[PDB]
Design a protein around this ligand. Sequence first.
Ligand SMILES: CCCC(=O)SCCNC(=O)CCNC(=O)[C@H](O)C(C)(C)COP(=O)(O)OP(=O)(O)OC[C@@H]1O[C@@H](n2cnc3c(N)ncnc32)[C@@H](O)[C@H]1OP(=O)(O)O
Ligand SMILES: NC(=O)C1=CN([C@@H]2O[C@@H](COP(=O)(O)OP(=O)(O)OC[C@H]3O[C@@H](n4cnc5c(N)ncnc54)[C@H](OP(=O)(O)O)[C@@H]3O)[C@@H](O)[C@H]2O)C=CC1
Ligand SMILES: NC(=O)c1ccc[n+]([C@@H]2O[C@@H](COP(=O)([O-])OP(=O)(O)OC[C@@H]3O[C@@H](n4cnc5c(N)ncnc54)[C@@H](OP(=O)(O)O)[C@H]3O)[C@H](O)[C@@H]2O)c1
Ligand SMILES: NC(=O)c1ccc[n+]([C@@H]2O[C@@H](COP(=O)([O-])OP(=O)(O)OC[C@H]3O[C@@H](n4cnc5c(N)ncnc54)[C@H](OP(=O)(O)O)[C@@H]3O)[C@H](O)[C@@H]2O)c1
Ligand SMILES: NC(=O)c1ccc[n+]([C@@H]2O[C@H](COP(=O)([O-])OP(=O)(O)OC[C@H]3O[C@@H](n4cnc5c(N)ncnc54)[C@@H](OP(=O)(O)O)[C@@H]3O)[C@@H](O)[C@H]2O)c1
Ligand SMILES: CCn1cnc2c(N)ncnc21
Lengths: 448, 445, 446, 447
Amino acid sequence: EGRHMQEILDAILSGDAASADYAALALPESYRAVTLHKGEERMFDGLASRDKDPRKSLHLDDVPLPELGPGEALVAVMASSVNYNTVWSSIFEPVSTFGFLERYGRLSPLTARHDLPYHVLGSDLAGVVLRTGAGVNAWKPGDEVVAHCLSVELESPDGHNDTMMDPEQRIWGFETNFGGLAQLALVKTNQLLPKPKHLTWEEAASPGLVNSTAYRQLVSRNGAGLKQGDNVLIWGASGGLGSYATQYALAGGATPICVVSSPRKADICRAMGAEAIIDRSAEGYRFWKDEHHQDPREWKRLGGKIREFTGGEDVDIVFEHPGRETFGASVYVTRKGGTIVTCASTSGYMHQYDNRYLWMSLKRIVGSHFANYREAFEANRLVAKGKIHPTLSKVYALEETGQAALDVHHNKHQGKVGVLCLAPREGLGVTDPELRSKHLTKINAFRN
Amino acid sequence: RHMQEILDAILSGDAASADYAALALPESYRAVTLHKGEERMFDGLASRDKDPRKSLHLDDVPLPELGPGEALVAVMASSVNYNTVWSSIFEPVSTFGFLERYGRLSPLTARHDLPYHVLGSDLAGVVLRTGAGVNAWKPGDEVVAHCLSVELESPDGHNDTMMDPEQRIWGFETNFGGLAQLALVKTNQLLPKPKHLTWEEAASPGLVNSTAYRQLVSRNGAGLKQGDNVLIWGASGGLGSYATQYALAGGATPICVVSSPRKADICRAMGAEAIIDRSAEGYRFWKDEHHQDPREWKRLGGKIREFTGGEDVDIVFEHPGRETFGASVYVTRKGGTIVTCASTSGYMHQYDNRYLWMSLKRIVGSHFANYREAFEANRLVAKGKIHPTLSKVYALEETGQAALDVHHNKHQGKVGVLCLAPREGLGVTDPELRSKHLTKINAFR
Amino acid sequence: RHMQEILDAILSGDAASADYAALALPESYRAVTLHKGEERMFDGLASRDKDPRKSLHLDDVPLPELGPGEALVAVMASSVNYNTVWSSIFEPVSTFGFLERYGRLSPLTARHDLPYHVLGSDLAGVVLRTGAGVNAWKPGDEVVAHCLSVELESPDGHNDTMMDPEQRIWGFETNFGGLAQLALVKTNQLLPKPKHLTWEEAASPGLVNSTAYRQLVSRNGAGLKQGDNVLIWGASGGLGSYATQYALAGGATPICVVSSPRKADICRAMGAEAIIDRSAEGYRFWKDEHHQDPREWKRLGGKIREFTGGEDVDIVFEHPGRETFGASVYVTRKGGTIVTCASTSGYMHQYDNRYLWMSLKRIVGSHFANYREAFEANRLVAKGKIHPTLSKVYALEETGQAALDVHHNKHQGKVGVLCLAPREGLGVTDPELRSKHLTKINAFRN
Amino acid sequence: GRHMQEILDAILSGDAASADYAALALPESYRAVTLHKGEERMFDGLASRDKDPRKSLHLDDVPLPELGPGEALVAVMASSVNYNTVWSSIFEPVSTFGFLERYGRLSPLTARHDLPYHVLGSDLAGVVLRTGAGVNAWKPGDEVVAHCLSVELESPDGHNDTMMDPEQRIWGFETNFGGLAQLALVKTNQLLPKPKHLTWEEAASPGLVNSTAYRQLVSRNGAGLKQGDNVLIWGASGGLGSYATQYALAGGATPICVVSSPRKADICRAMGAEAIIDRSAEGYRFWKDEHHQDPREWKRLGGKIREFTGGEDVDIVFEHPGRETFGASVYVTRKGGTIVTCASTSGYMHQYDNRYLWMSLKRIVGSHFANYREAFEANRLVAKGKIHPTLSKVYALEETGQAALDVHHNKHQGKVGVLCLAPREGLGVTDPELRSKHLTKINAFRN
Ligand SMILES: CCCC(=O)SCCNC(=O)CCNC(=O)[C@H](O)C(C)(C)COP(=O)(O)OP(=O)(O)OC[C@@H]1O[C@@H](n2cnc3c(N)ncnc32)[C@@H](O)[C@H]1OP(=O)(O)O
Ligand SMILES: NC(=O)C1=CN([C@@H]2O[C@@H](COP(=O)(O)OP(=O)(O)OC[C@H]3O[C@@H](n4cnc5c(N)ncnc54)[C@H](OP(=O)(O)O)[C@@H]3O)[C@@H](O)[C@H]2O)C=CC1
Ligand SMILES: NC(=O)c1ccc[n+]([C@@H]2O[C@@H](COP(=O)([O-])OP(=O)(O)OC[C@@H]3O[C@@H](n4cnc5c(N)ncnc54)[C@@H](OP(=O)(O)O)[C@H]3O)[C@H](O)[C@@H]2O)c1
Ligand SMILES: NC(=O)c1ccc[n+]([C@@H]2O[C@@H](COP(=O)([O-])OP(=O)(O)OC[C@H]3O[C@@H](n4cnc5c(N)ncnc54)[C@H](OP(=O)(O)O)[C@@H]3O)[C@H](O)[C@@H]2O)c1
Ligand SMILES: NC(=O)c1ccc[n+]([C@@H]2O[C@H](COP(=O)([O-])OP(=O)(O)OC[C@H]3O[C@@H](n4cnc5c(N)ncnc54)[C@@H](OP(=O)(O)O)[C@@H]3O)[C@@H](O)[C@H]2O)c1
Ligand SMILES: CCn1cnc2c(N)ncnc21
């Protein structure tokens, strides 16, 4: 385990270590981390994406601690989660992350710390601050934290009216090194948020990435600007993003039309409170009739199915992310004047759509990407208030991150797949038991 | 003759509203018409070989009955645009089909269901009579027209009438259009005539001007602000020419795209300086029928950066569609907007969504303009910030030739038509403002 | 009576459109009216002592001529609104000035310029006739009506009809209002009657619910989002009874202000938890007639923070005006919004602009709702997501006392008025949906 | 000082490379205009107008501060004296040392600013000499001006618009090492590129008033101006109003300029405006007494505006005078229009008739200063030659006290600049063609 690392974990588990105790703990010289290796980035060349196996490319390595810099924190990570970006990274698609690290390392000697022949992955965490760098006053050793994954330098003026517009804006653990699928992580302190006290470590680590994105994409004025009464088509409603978009639609007074591909996922949507659920596999939609042409009759068939649930109304908003396969239909079925908001292209990023439906019906396609610190704060605030709930289905140990990534790669999962890092077992970290007890049924709605 | 006395009063310049209210209406007026019986005369031909001179008739027609909230206008000039051309060759379908269907609705809509169709979706002229409830307009008022008519019985359009589900283009999906000596319009289509322009100039900006205004200037489109860089496709064409003028008048920089040196010269006459000739540059955005070439998106992006000092455009003014749309999405600045109101080259758009979401761009659909936007666009013409783009004017009897000229893209700017006006150059009552702007007013001649 | 035959047709429940078209129109109808010769009758009185019972008359009036784009409606029920009170005490100015100005536009608007004013800005009922150009509505249609009157001849209103320069409020700046057996409206005022509600229930939301929707929910007002904290003045009155519902159903947190424990109980019945009784707290925002007390602003702000865990509200839902408006601006969060549609306590607002500009706040003026917003607000009632808030119902002949109730702030929720309806409880045609929501529907009942 | 002279020689030569600046030895002191902590009570009992900045401002040699992460050391060629600088120099509303001391408790880095002297100045134009750790976008030799807003952004509040940050500092006012000195220390996210067609002192002039007017009038966080709009602009030849007038014209809108003298009206015409109201000549009396306004005077203003607009009411009112004018501002605004306010010069207790606000769906939008993106865009429009500086008079660094007195007593119609390292006026232009095109408007406020 390592003596210094074990002493850090014992401090956390004791429950009554003070900030000065964490400050006095000796730092280990290495930590265990899930990594990619630069020499292997071509190992899947010529394969179909589905045949690329994250278990072959993900390694469990001992890596040295990076040097702590200004505005940063070293964090002892109790738990993290698998995200799709973890899957993209592990199959080197659409491009290898080592290209991101190389470009990032050119900015300054500080960013050059990230340009290494291994890539520590992971874009969520829940844990405890161990150290803070120069200029940090809002966070201190011992603070229980979750982290959002926005990395912004904010030297350029572009990001000072919404930090997502920073030209050097990046995603921590994907376009930067020292991610959260490890025993320790390095983050900017303007990634830190207070851990929800009613959640376990693994529950608390599970919402950060997808919940923040869903909030900006659906709730905020920088995305679709949902209002009560809206009809919202939610693709992938029982996956990572969808498990929060569906909660936002319902808690916001809108009507979600949830799309899933199994009756088990349909049951979860009903457990969340949704009533209008479409099983795209039962319906057998074939939006593309061959490699280059779509089928407008299948767009219309989806549109008619939506109208069955809404009493003849077309959706005000489409919550997109599947990309090429569904995007033509998404644009077609949207109400006149409505919005398709997209943050991803899982099935393929070369989108095709019929612009007659977009311009003649005054629709818009809004590109959305993660969330600024304020939006991340607001999304985590709603979790802390028990208004939005974690969606954990299954938890793996850190050593099993390859199988966890394979689960998501092959769409075998529901909700979020969590990963224990330093936490020795599930169930630890709750310090608000009465709030937990109030919401326990919903907290566990995605569990196997 | 009653029509001649109307024309004499207009030409005198000093007739009063009561004088117009006292003039006796003619029993018929001269109009450019389609005939119901001929709607198949072009069957089998390619579109380019359909000759509007064969289908367009110069007839004497009776006056429609004036309804509530309508105006009878004495028309001094009008215009020929692509809509007029398509109707004149019965494309995509005969206009009589909609006139008949909608004419089943009520005795009011049935007025338009006739065996002839008076075409024309622009006018500049003088109000003669107004229907019941009209408050804003009276005989003698000098007017141009916004061609979009809405009934607004649905709530959908009451926060922006472009969301109304039942729009009609006057002179296309209605009868009694502007290519005639008289016309019938709703009073909430009327706009004040710019005083520094001639009749035919005032009738010219019309729908492409208000469409460009909504798409580029208004908050329902791109919401231009001074300092913005704007890529403007087809910058000497209809939409692009007004877009270029709006960019300059708003304190922004147009990056104008055209396909010939003559068109570049016209952009300079409008006041632009950053001009890209897409054919001289040889852009091949598509490699074959199914795959684009991102190296060519980037080559365009690098050329844009030559004019802007390294900056990428805040706004792309789109309308070519499939050929250009992938490049438009690529070159747009992080957080920027691609606004689109047409897809000339093809409506099946393909683009790389990684650039759109990773750089938080948006594609905003826009269509025509609501009446407030049409008013603001015409008001910027009236202020002398935006100028008409006439190349050539025909007499009413020659409307067939005017339509063929548009059909075969014979002029760089717009084609006007004199209706009652006996010659070009009449109707200016602000000679001081006109003198200031004469060179730009004539930039397309 | 031709009127009795119309009512019997409605009460039968199975008359067809053709039957309504064949019914003879009566030559007069009963109407609550003001009289032009009386607009000075309250000279020298304090507003409180002006009595709506003295100024409101029950008259037989002739039917107006039906014009293009209009509908003659048989009115089963209506409601009292505060503009009914304002009208009846001729404050801040006489409505006859509005009618005189309106009548100058055209011979059609001149129909409204009469020596009597038929009041009422809500209705639920049945269409009898439609004018020229009307295809979306026909006789026999069961309707409620919003009170926006827009002519839409000017370009100004074609990107949001509230900006029409000739925009008016039906029954307040126009004649032939809904507190009568018949009413004349534009057909673009008509919305489908919620089928699970009685006539009086269906007449009660229209005006205040539409306004609260534009003011709080829509992008033309405050643009509420879930997680917001919202200060709601008058939370158990007409506007507040809908604003509180929109806050809760939209996922936000209302801080409800009321002035009695009885009203606090209603707020809790609606689902609110953070309730401030301004009478129990004894706020005195004004030291005297010209100066406010920033210590009292701060005391309100501190009380709000007790409910929100130290957070200041994102939105203030204003309408009390002078008395509260300085506090509303002070307590709002940095970057937040004060949205106002009224000034009940006085329209000369005073506030400290340092708090507005240095904290980048905004004051958004809001007025009624365009047709799309009114449609959306009625849609949420029809879907059973927003509920009527009727507390008491009066017969048409007692409209004077109904208005006095509101004038003196003795009511809660909405006070309804029966017009043609001979009693309460009629008009439900969706009993299954009604039973699902009946407990909430009755939350305001005495 | 030899090292300081070598730095100035490099700048004046015009062709020093970045590596040349990196190799220049730093001086161990620099000349600076300072306040002294022990003198903060020297004006007690006096009326503000009689407090003399020439008595409180010192010309001192001071040591260089330690350069921290994300900071730059700048060789200052020119600076400015604004109202903020004047207030500091007379210890109003309180002594600036109070904040420097409290904030200096936070950390060793904030404590660098807690000193017995305070180097003032919230504008600069100059050349980057050194950059601290992590800096990417700036290097030695870069020609810069500064945005004076300093934010640490540890709170999430300001990450959708940094003006919502709860803990801003105005550099040179709530920080030390200001611009009225030969050297200055700023955060690199205060730096902006110097407009090449302007002199050092001209480039330092637009500063905060220009970017505040930009946010208030042009940006979507303020009034969101569009071409064709009619804009009522109070105080149109003053600081805020002069830039607002230029933004209105540059954006294709019509400014209706309000001033109080014929000489001020001439300046508005020099800027390119035509619609000008002299509020003193018209004799507006919006307030009848201390407590009641005169709506007939609101209407008289409204009628005068209509004379210039062909009968239209303004889409936007650019407010900042406050109590005296704010009732009229709300009344005359068009239905659906916006009153934007960023100050209350005449009094912050605003009174207005809310019937006009809600019945015509108007709004009052508070704006304050500018975030760094808005400051970049405002300076960019100066660099494009759309917006011009408004300098009236320039003093040498040694005369900064008299410069501050001139501003304190409103001696000039435009701005007062200060030469720091620059040995004379007129240096630093590297785009003479663009300057020639705009020379007349550039000098509109001389002298
Ligand atoms: C749905 C439930 C609703 C509720 O329950 S909400 C609570 C109940 N409701 C209330 O409490 C409010 C009741 N209503 C009122 O209090 C009054 O109507 C008030 C105060 C709103 C306006 O009062 P006005 O004085 O009538 O308005 P104003 O504009 O002064 O009109 C006369 C015009 O002054 C001129 N003029 C205008 N602007 C300008 C300008 N910028 N420059 C120059 N001249 C200007 C002319 O245009 C002139 O026209 P003319 O030359 O005469 O043709
Ligand atoms: N918080 C901060 O850090 C700062 C705040 N400020 C504030 O913003 C300022 C305004 O900016 P600025 O433009 O640079 O100041 P200026 O002195 O340069 O311009 C103001 C000109 O407002 C006009 N004005 C003043 N008082 C009245 C009135 N009662 N009625 C109508 N017009 C009036 C005058 O113009 P005219 O007589 O010609 O009509 C005045 O010359 C302040 O007055 C100040 O309160 C300034 C600096 C820093
Ligand atoms: N829905 C309606 O009722 C209606 C009515 C009129 C028009 N429209 C539509 O909107 C029209 C555009 O309006 P418009 O008046 O501006 O037409 P226009 O005057 O003919 O100019 C538009 C052309 O766009 C450019 N262009 C065309 N094809 C291009 C391509 N493949 N790649 C790059 N640029 C291309 C420009 O040319 P260069 O770069 O070659 O110089 C310009 O000629 C569409 O053509 C379409 O007809 C619709
Ligand atoms: N512009 C529009 O479209 C529109 C639409 C509807 C109404 N309105 C207007 O808003 C009105 C209120 O309308 P409403 O229908 O809701 O009337 P309402 O039923 O009487 O409700 C108002 C509530 O405000 C509170 N209140 C009254 N005076 C107050 C004061 N001085 N300070 C604090 N709170 C006070 C009372 O609540 P508590 O005593 O319990 O605190 C009362 O329940 C205005 O006067 C007006 O007519 C405007
Ligand atoms: N830009 C950002 O900030 C951001 C943030 C998070 C995620 N993302 C991206 O967004 C994508 C989804 O992320 P996630 O965490 O939600 O992953 P996820 O847990 O796997 O959920 C995706 C869901 O999409 C559906 N789906 C998958 N392929 C589909 C297809 N071809 N057609 C229709 N539906 C399909 C759902 O399944 P069923 O219909 O089968 O039930 C699946 O549960 C990923 O590409 C990820 O990289 C982007
Ligand atoms: C052709 C009719 N039609 C138009 N839009 C749709 C739709 N979304 N869904 C189904 N049918 C439709």
